[PDB]
Structures are given as structure tokens and as C-alpha cells.
Amino acid sequence: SMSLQVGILGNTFANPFMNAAGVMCSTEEELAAMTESTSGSLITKSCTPARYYTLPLGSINSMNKGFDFYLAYSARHHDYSRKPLFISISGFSAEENAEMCKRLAPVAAEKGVILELNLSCPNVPGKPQVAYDFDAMRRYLAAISEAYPHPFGVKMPPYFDFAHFDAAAEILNQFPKVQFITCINSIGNGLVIDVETESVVIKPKQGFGGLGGRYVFPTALANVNAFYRRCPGKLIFGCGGVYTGEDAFLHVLAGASMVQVGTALHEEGAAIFERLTAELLDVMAKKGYKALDEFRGKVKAM
Amino acid sequence: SMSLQVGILGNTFANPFMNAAGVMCSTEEELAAMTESTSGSLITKSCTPALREGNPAPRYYTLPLGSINSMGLPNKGFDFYLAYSARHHDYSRKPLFISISGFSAEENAEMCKRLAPVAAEKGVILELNLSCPNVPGKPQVAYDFDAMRRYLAAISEAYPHPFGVKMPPYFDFAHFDAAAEILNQFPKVQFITCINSIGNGLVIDVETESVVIKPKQGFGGLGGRYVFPTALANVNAFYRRCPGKLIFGCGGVYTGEDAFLHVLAGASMVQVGTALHEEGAAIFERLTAELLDVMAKKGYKALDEFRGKVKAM
Ligand SMILES: Cc1cc2nc3c(=O)[nH]c(=O)nc-3n(C[C@H](O)[C@H](O)[C@H](O)COP(=O)(O)O)c2cc1C
Ligand SMILES: Cc1cc2nc3c(=O)[nH]c(=O)nc-3n(C[C@H](O)[C@H](O)[C@H](O)COP(=O)(O)O)c2cc1C
Ligand SMILES: *[C@@H](c1cccc(O)c1)C1C(=O)NC(=O)NC1=O
Ligand SMILES: *[C@@H](c1cccc(O)c1)C1C(=O)NC(=O)NC1=O
């Protein structure tokens, strides 16, 4: 009757849900829990070649086992009969990312793991989000496209004006290997102070860190839709502020193919996926929808 | 004993609270209500040289944790706010700020030339809006550092008095540093208001499957609880980088504890937008009481005992 299936990148995903990179995906036990859950997919922690605080309305963070570990997991330890796997990489240079992609390529070809390239980590000492520098963004994507023979996706930071949406999309549309865009990473460099101690709540970088959870939901929907509109030849994955199936429904209406869950999954654990699928199917049932293809991107004007 | 007084800009303010520009400050009745309130100050709606009727409605919507707006600069025009400052405002009640938001550097310079004698005679204080996120086809001016410098140079040439700037949020230290470096080169910039709304969010209603505000495909500026950690970050980042300037905090204030944290991050004044839209001007009685409660539990007698004194871990 109804289905949450999503048929993309050549795979049938059972439902659109997965963890957000960095949440519940660092240890063998966590990857196993994600694999055993009802999520449609899972992604690893952003890795490099070789901290968190719960807030009333979400989270702030300033946060790997190395690329070797997550490659070996993708190569020999992940059960692909359960669900597909994504791997996130966030090298410190175009070259570091490229050397990783060259080593990832035989594993992607043989097992099917899919690369998400992180251009938006807001916590790299002395180095702003890569995708806030459009010249650097273009060099990274050219370097990866030359080094990596396979399709990949990009994790984007939020933008806040149409001139930036336009410029980012114009660059991404020049790279046909970029088959998906994940909107969004955390809202960078927020600051939380505790009233009683009069002190910041995370230690690095004078307390500044990336925001997730309820704080980011309208920004996340805006970025999903902005890129859905400007990159019709690519898929958009939504990430940001998802706590319920209604939240996921709104991300799909904005354009999302997959829906990633970060802060809410950190708080609730992998059982959240059982609740999210039920809730989303319930919204669909009330509206008579039978498939996500019927309303993905179909947000209406007022 | 305890006190919320602020002594800045050659004025004495009874407490740090004021409305945020654009909230409860467009008509004479709203301005009189703000003046009759217990707020420490007030600011007018950002104005353009001529009156504007604004974007089509609905252009504001109440969210679970705040607001979204595409107001589109509806305002009675500069001549109306100038007349308010020159002839109607009771300065014995509290100091007044005037917000201006012309569509180019030259429009703002022309308004400043006419404002200058009124500022001199009456003492109204200029806040220049460099961050409106709802101008058709033109991004936040302060997201274009070359344009920002041009605006500050044009105003500085045209306007003899010190003034403040309403800034959009930034999200990385490279931008904090670039913005600060520019502001520190303009001696007439005496205060920096952090922040305007987080631009170009989007809200969709589950039932209608439609955007909830009409203009610009539903994209609009976010206020309220969504913006608080970003606001505090911006206040503190500029407080650290522009020690020669005052910082005014704006964003996410609903309680005296929220205000306390703005001040701890560096705020001299604290502006209230969405929460004031919702509660009305009695909010200022509650915010002062709550802020005094925080101070009493900590033994603070004056805001300078803790302003800017956020601690590391
Ligand atoms: C503790 C933590 C660690 C994260 N680590 C990563 C990471 O390694 N790579 C990445 O792309 N995003 C990382 N993120 C960002 C999330 O993937 C997600 O983009 C963000 O939290 C917004 O989603 P949410 O509102 O559901 O939390 C991290 C988020 C948190 C809270
Ligand atoms: C309806 C509305 C109208 C606004 N109009 C202006 C404006 O004219 N000038 C300006 O500088 N900011 C304007 N703003 C932004 C507010 O001054 C403020 O920066 C923002 O709402 C964040 O504060 P808050 O979290 O308390 O709402 C407006 C905000 C709202 C909600
Ligand atoms: C950035 C990050 C990249 C690689 C490794 C690591 O530990 C972190 C990261 C991000 O992308 N998003 C976020 O919210 N927090 C981070 O630390
Ligand atoms: C921007 C605005 C620009 C020009 C004139 C005017 O009256 C307002 C405005 C802003 O600064 N902040 C906000 O949240 N909404 C807007 O529409």
C-alpha cells in the first residue's frame, strides 16, 4: 500500500532515515547498533588520514579512529545485506582527501560503500568551513573528481542568503560526480554560557561550537529547498532538527531524498528509527500518500 | 542597593533593556507605548527615505520557538521618524535611538545630513542597519565587506556624530575578524548591535504543505529562541575584537537569565524583539525583575561587576 522506500544511487533504501555523520558511528559497537536498527542506512564518523553538551533546545559540540579503521569496517565488517553504508571523510587538505579517495576506491567498487565529503566542519582549528570559501570549494571538488572514479556527495554548511545559495550551486553543478548534497552541517560557532557557573559549557575555542537540534530546523529546511531548486540534477539529503516524522515529512516536502538524524538520535538512541518510520507513515496515511516520490519537493507557495 | 543603570554614550539609562528595531516602533502609538514602558530605551523602525507599505501579507509568523518574517521594510518614511525624534519624543523619560536602512550608501548619507542637526539639538542616537535579510535582490550589506566599508565611509563623511551599526550574524572566526578589522577603522562607530535575524530560514506547515509567509518563496529572517546561541557568540566575538566600541546584544531574550548571559558575553544594552512582539511592553517589568533576581542570588550590585566576564572552562 504505502512505502517509505527510496530508490537512489542504484540502491533501494528501506526508508529515508539514517544517522547524521558523527552521531552514533565512531565505535564498532555503535556501528553495529546502527546496522541492527531499523534505519534505512548509516554513515561513519568523518575521518582523517590517521566536547558535546545537551541544551534545552538541541546541542552544541566542539568534537576518529582514522581512515584505516573506517575503511576496514567498510571493507570487511559491515553487513551490506542489512542496509547500504556511507563513509564520511574530512581531510585537512584537498590532497589529504584525495589520497584517501584513491584508497577508498577499490572498496567502494567491490562492496558499494558511498562517500560523503565533509566540506563544512565548523570546529577545525584555524580553518573555517571549506564551503564558505568558494574558490577552495571548487579546488576540493576538482581534486576529488580527478582522484576518485566513483560518484560521491558533499556535506554542506548552512547558507543565509540567496547570493551564496546561487554561488554554491553554480559550483556544484559543474561536477557531475557530485550526485548528492547533504544540507546541513551544524550552524557553526554558536556560544552557550551556563548561568550558575558563568562559564562556557565546552572547552575548546573559547566555548564556540556547532549547533544542532531544534535551533537549526528552519535553516536546514531553507538550505534543503534552496539546493533542491538550484540542483535539480542531483539528490538532496536533509539533515537538521529532525525529532519527529512530521519534521521528516517537512524535509521531504522541501526536497530531501534521505533524512539524517543527529541530536535527536544522540539523546534517544537507535530505537528512534522505529518511532520515526511509524510517525512518517502516519502523516502519509492521513494525507493519502503512498510513496515519498509523490511529495518530495512539492512544498507549495502561499 | 542593586542597580541596572547603564552609563554609556553620554547618557544614563535606567536599565539595559530596549525594543529591537522593527518591533513595536512603527507608529506614534507604539513609540509612545515604548516611552511609557519601563524600558531603558527604545529605537524606531528602520526607515527608508520615503514611506513604504511593505511586502504582501502574511509576512510574519509565530513559530514553536520564535518567529519568521519577511516584513519588507514597511515603514512610515524617514520624515516621520525624524519628526518623532525632533518634536514628539520625551527625552526626560529615556534616550532614543533612530534606525535607518536606506537602499544604498547615498540614500543613507542623505538621511544622515538631515538627521545631524536633530541629533545635535535633541540627542537622538543613530543605529545604521547593515543587515536586513529581506531586501529584494540585495543580500545583507555586511555580508559584502567591500560594500560595508563603502557604507561606513559614506556615512562617516556625511554625519558628524558617533553612530552604531546593526550587524547580521556571522558563523566563523575569519568573518568575525574581517568585520572587526573594518569596524575598528571607523572611529565614529561607537556601538555594534549583534544580531539582526538569522536570514533566509524557511518554515512549511504540515497540514497545508505550504510555506507560512508569502514573499520570496517563503524564506524569511528568524528571531527568537532559535537565534540565542548565535546571538551570544556574535556579542562575545565582537566584544573581544572591538574593545573600543560598545556591543548591544539582540536575539533570543525571553527572560532575565537570557539578558544576564548577553551582559556576561559583553552586552551593554539588551534589545528584545520577538518576545516583545508576543508579550507587549509589560515584558520590561518582568525582565528587570528577573535580571535583578539573578544578580541578587550572585551578590552583584551593578552590571559592571559581570559585564564581559564570561569565564573559560
Ligand atoms: C557530536 C556531533 C558530532 C558531529 N560530527 C560530525 C562529523 O564528524 N561530520 C559531519 O559531517 N557532521 C558532524 N556533525 C553534524 C551532524 O552530522 C549534523 O549535521 C548536525 O548535528 C545537524 O543535525 P541535527 O539537528 O539532527 O543534530 C556532528 C554533530 C554532533 C552533534
Ligand atoms: C517583525 C520584525 C521586524 C523587524 N524589523 C527590523 C528592522 O526594521 N530593523 C532591524 O534592524 N531589525 C529588524 N528586525 C530584527 C530584530 O531587530 C532582531 O534583530 C531580531 O528579531 C532578533 O531578536 P529577537 O530574537 O529578540 O527577535 C525585525 C524583526 C522582526 C521579528
Ligand atoms: C567536523 C569534524 C571533521 C572531522 C573529524 C571531526 O572529529 C570533526 C565536525 C563537523 O563536521 N560538524 C560538527 O558539528 N562537529 C565537528 O566537529
Ligand atoms: C530589514 C529592513 C530593511 C529596510 C527597511 C526596513 O524597514 C527593514 C529587516 C531587518 O533588518 N530585519 C528583519 O528581521 N526583517 C526585515 O525585514
Author numbering:
A (entry chain A): 0 to 49, 58 to 70, 74 to 312
B (entry chain B): 0 to 312
Which passages does the manuscript contain on this structure?
We present the first covalent inhibitors of Leishmania braziliensis dihydroorotate dehydrogenase (LbDHODH), a key enzyme in pyrimidine biosynthesis with a reactive cysteine (Cys131) in its active site. It facilitates the stereospecific oxidation of the (S)-dihydroorotate (DHO) isomer to orotate (ORO) via a ping-pong mechanism. Moreover, LbDHODH possesses a nucleophilic cysteine residue (Cys131) as its catalytic residue, whereas human DHODH (HsDHODH) features a serine (Ser215) at the equivalent position.
To elucidate the interaction of BARB derivatives with LbDHODH, compounds 2a, 2c, 2g, and 3c were cocrystallized with the enzyme under similar conditions as described for orotate. The crystal structures were determined by molecular replacement using 4WZH32 as the search model and refined to high resolution, 1.75 Å, 1.9 Å, 1.45 Å and 1.85 Å for 2a, 2c, 2g, and 3c, respectively, all with excellent geometric validation. LbDHODH-2a contains two FMN cofactors, two 2a molecules, four glycerol molecules, and 272 solvent sites; LbDHODH-2c includes two FMN cofactors, two 2c molecules, two glycerol molecules, three sulfate ions, and 148 solvent sites; LbDHODH-2g consists of two FMN cofactors, two 2g molecules, four glycerol molecules, and 457 solvent sites; and LbDHODH-3c features two FMN cofactors, two 3c molecules, one glycerol molecule, five sulfate ions, and 278 solvent sites. Due to the absence of clear electron density, the following fragments were omitted from the final models: in LbDHODH-2a, Ala50–Ala56 and Leu72 in chain A; in LbDHODH-2c, Arg51–Gly53 and Leu72 in chain A; in LbDHODH-2g, Leu51–Pro57 and Gly71–Pro73 in chain A; and in LbDHODH-3c, residues 131–138 in chain A and 134–138 in chain B. Additionally, for all complexes, the C-terminal residue Asp313 from both chains was excluded from the final model. Interestingly, the crystal structures of the LbDHODH complexes reveal well-defined electron density for the BARB core, confirming that it adopts the same hydrogen bonding network as orotate. In the crystal structures of LbDHODH in complex with 2a, 2c, and 2g, a continuous electron density is observed between the side-chain thiol of Cys131 and the exocyclic moiety of the inhibitors, indicating covalent bond formation. This covalent interaction induces the catalytic loop (residues 130–139) to adopt a closed conformation. In the LbDHODH-2a and -2g complexes, the side chain of the BARB derivative partially occupies the pocket normally occupied by the side chain of Leu72 (chain B), leading to the absence of electron density for the side chain of this residue and highlighting the conformational flexibility of this region. The cysteine residue in the covalent ligands 2a, 2c, and 2g adopts a conformation similar to that observed with orotate.
